[PDB]
Design a protein around this ligand. Sequence first.
Ligand SMILES: [Mg+2]
Lengths: 156, 59, 82, 148, 84, 94, 94, 140, 120
Amino acid sequence: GYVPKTSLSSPPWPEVVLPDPVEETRHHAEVVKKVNEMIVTGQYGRLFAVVHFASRQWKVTSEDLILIGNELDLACGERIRLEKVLLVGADNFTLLGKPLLGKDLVRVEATVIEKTESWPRIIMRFRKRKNFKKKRIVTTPQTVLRINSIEIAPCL
Amino acid sequence: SSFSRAPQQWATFARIWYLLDGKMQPPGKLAAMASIRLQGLHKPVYHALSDCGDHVVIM
Amino acid sequence: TYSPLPDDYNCNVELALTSDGRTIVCYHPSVDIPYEHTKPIPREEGPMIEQLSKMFFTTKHRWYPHGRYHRCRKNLNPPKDR
Amino acid sequence: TARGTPSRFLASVLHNGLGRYVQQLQRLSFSVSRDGASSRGAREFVEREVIDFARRNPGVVIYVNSRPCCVPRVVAEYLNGAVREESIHCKSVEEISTLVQKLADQSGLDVIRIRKPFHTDNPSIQGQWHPFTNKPTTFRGLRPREVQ
Amino acid sequence: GGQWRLQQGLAANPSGYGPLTELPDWSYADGRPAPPMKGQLRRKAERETFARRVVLLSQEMDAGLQAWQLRQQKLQEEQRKQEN
Amino acid sequence: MTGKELFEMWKIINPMGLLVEELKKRNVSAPESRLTRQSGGTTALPLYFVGLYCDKKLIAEGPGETVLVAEEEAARVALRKLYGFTENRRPWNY
Amino acid sequence: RGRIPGRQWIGKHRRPRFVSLRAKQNMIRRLEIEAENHYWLSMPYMTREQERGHAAVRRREAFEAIKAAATSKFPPHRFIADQLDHLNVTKKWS
Amino acid sequence: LRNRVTDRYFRIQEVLKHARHFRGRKNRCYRLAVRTVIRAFVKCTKARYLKKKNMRTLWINRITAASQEHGLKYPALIGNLVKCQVELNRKVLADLAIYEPKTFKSLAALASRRRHEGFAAALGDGKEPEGIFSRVVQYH
Amino acid sequence: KFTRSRIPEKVFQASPEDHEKYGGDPQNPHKLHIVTRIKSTRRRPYWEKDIIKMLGLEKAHTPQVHKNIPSVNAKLKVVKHLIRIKPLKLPQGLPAEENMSNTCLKSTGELVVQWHLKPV
Ligand SMILES: [Mg+2]
């Protein structure tokens, strides 16, 4: 099945050889241990987190503010835990969920700072030459939350 | 990181100089690369209103 | 020896999976610029608009003034974030 | 519309949640009337709900003034100095209660368009992207086509 | 990439069924569970109605088959009885 | 002080001098300014990333419009790192 | 130059339309779906005789509910409490 | 003139207030201001769909920029992240690219890793062991 | 004239090749169809619109369970070009009253009776 070297004899892309599964799993374990030791020793500063709240994903950090477009049925100043954290990251390492990280791994806590109504939004419908004109004013409830802390535990 | 506000902004919105060599190169592919760089579409901070273009020198 | 991406720029990425395989760990320490990859520190309206355009690699149009309407429409106390 | 209206950025009065939550509302002045069908709901609210609300929110001073009025009103004064005046004219007890609770839970910041649904004072932890990130460095820092 | 999700058996839309959406979005810092989300309650009601309809249809079809079998019996032993 | 910068709160002059003094106290060789990266050197909008190297080891680097400004900002960055008030430092605990 | 007489897409001389590989693939995908539909419809569970009357009771009960809803249409009740509550519009204090 | 309108001033002002920032007589004459304001409100209503569409387009453009910086294409990055079962959306991906370049480099490395695992699986089609990252967590 | 289409019966007579391809045994046929409207009734005949409404497939991509009986099959044959039909599978059997509230219809067409939302 030999083919002389021509422009089309071999694919343009380079040939990649993935590491053997056994040695690669050993390396995986070593890297996980290293990152776990970093967490144990607290060798991280600010932590950010991609957290799925409401229906969206927010990139979040301690002291951050988030505007959820609805009432949450929570008294202002009440503390909450955001449970759907997709990603937690530090300066030197990041942990990715599949698709969600563990509760024992990540704890993101927020506080319901404010409950408000959005500024009036105009919904205008108009069709030319049909006497079709309509106007509506809508104020969507909103809650402002402040993300107090993002804590990680050595559970890798 | 840890930069002051003005230096950080300058570094982020600095315009870079790229060099293309057109010898035996298709003018269309050269133009595609040059247009991307000129628009700044190669920058993650790209926005049509940010004037994030970069200089392209084609020899 | 396999590396998904070159490690000569930005952080050195090392991917891993926890034993349960339910979470990916990424170790990406930043790469410092080698000292050898560094150099030592060295030690009228028409003509004006043409000079400015040459200096800043722009067109003449932006350097012309604007009317009072636009000047007073411009917001002098814009909201500031961060 | 947004272009015809002022806008601001999401913010808190004094980083209201970092150390401790502080109720931004501080004063509630209810101008009510002894007589007048407009302030019937206001009178019922003063009778049945204002005391409970006052004891629930000890940080808010409530001044109930009953004087001849055609349009009963509630004036909410917040810590940041904002004053919001609302009409409780011909509003039922439930409507007045919901309005008062909304004022209590609402901050003094202007109710205008908010440019971003989020506000970070430390957006970057790994370093904000600049053109020289993800760019390899060359030996002796030689720019392209440099001879020496 | 919904085709890959379909192949793996997940919802083509990640916003569909799955932990990412059906799990509670939050809980009290004390650990107390949050009240069920409105969307989750509606989805649970819809799945309950779907399951109840599935059961109803299957039971109706089984009952119809049993009734048809019983009718065929009745016919067979009748035919035999007036044959004898 | 949330969101504030070290030298936004504490005005200083001669950050290079402060850095030299601090490194002398910490028994580290005096920093060497070095041109790590540059762009548009001859233009009216240059960028200069200047790094401070001690014992051929990068301690910090800073951007600027001119080389002097870049060096001054790199000194500020090095001071922030030495004092542990980096932007990505551990957030205050409440 | 290059005019299409009259209106595009309607006249005798219409603007030519050409099928792209994208459209061909879309149509093929839909055809595959419909072929699978044919397969899954080609295997009935019960026969017509077996199904005869197996849902008659439920259908009759559903129509009985519909008829009851239709025939229960009748004006709502009226209450002295509702009539007298209007006197509260002039409720005052003392 | 038994009954006459006395609020016409305020009725006109309800529109002129929204028309104040227009150009020409459209900000002064009601006969013109009303038409312009109706058009402006209709545009504002219709602009929410375009706002969402343009936000997604901008996120895709920025993700493409970052992926090209790391040597990948946007389709490859997105598809391989999905295959890795990382459900980061385009907004968050663009935010990471702008503000967390090292995290985005890690994500691009993961996407390329999964892409190469898929290529290896296709090449050695059969019952060869599944790629380490290719393995999919199953939820029940 | 455009009229209602009479599909020849031979179209709905599966072959062994089809059985192998689609994984369905001619004996022991499936009891219930999962039907999803994947096509708009707009630009289609009013009779197809009415059949879709009868089957309750007004919302697109919303699965509906139907009996695999000749009459429902006739309606599905009428509107087959607008719908996707799959066999409902019950790996754990029919849901019981105890687990009626924990069911979920997975994209594979299986109505699992336990939905824990936890990794296996
Ligand atoms: Mg024409």
